[PDB]
């Protein structure tokens, strides 16, 4: 995995294991994803091709 969004640029040598959604917009997300409610993590793809 890796991350696409975070509150701010992490400091050097810090571990972030947070899960809360990142509010790109002023819209409240209330713990549930939606439009402008971006889940931070994203998986990769590792095919032999």
């Amino acid at each position: 995995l890796y991350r696409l969004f975070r509150k701010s640029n992490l400091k050097p040598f810090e571990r972030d294991i947070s899960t809360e959604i990142y509010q790109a917009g002023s819209t409240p997300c209330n713990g549930v994803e939606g439009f402008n409610c971006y889940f931070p993590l994203q998986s990769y793809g590792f095919q032999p091709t």
């Binding site: 400091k11 050097p12 040598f13 810090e14």
Partner: peptide
Amino acid sequence: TFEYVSFKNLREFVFKNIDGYFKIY
């Protein structure tokens, strides 16, 4: 994720989060 081993007396301590490390005196 860790474990370690160590009014007449007063304990004085300084804690600092520097460089992503925690230092104690």
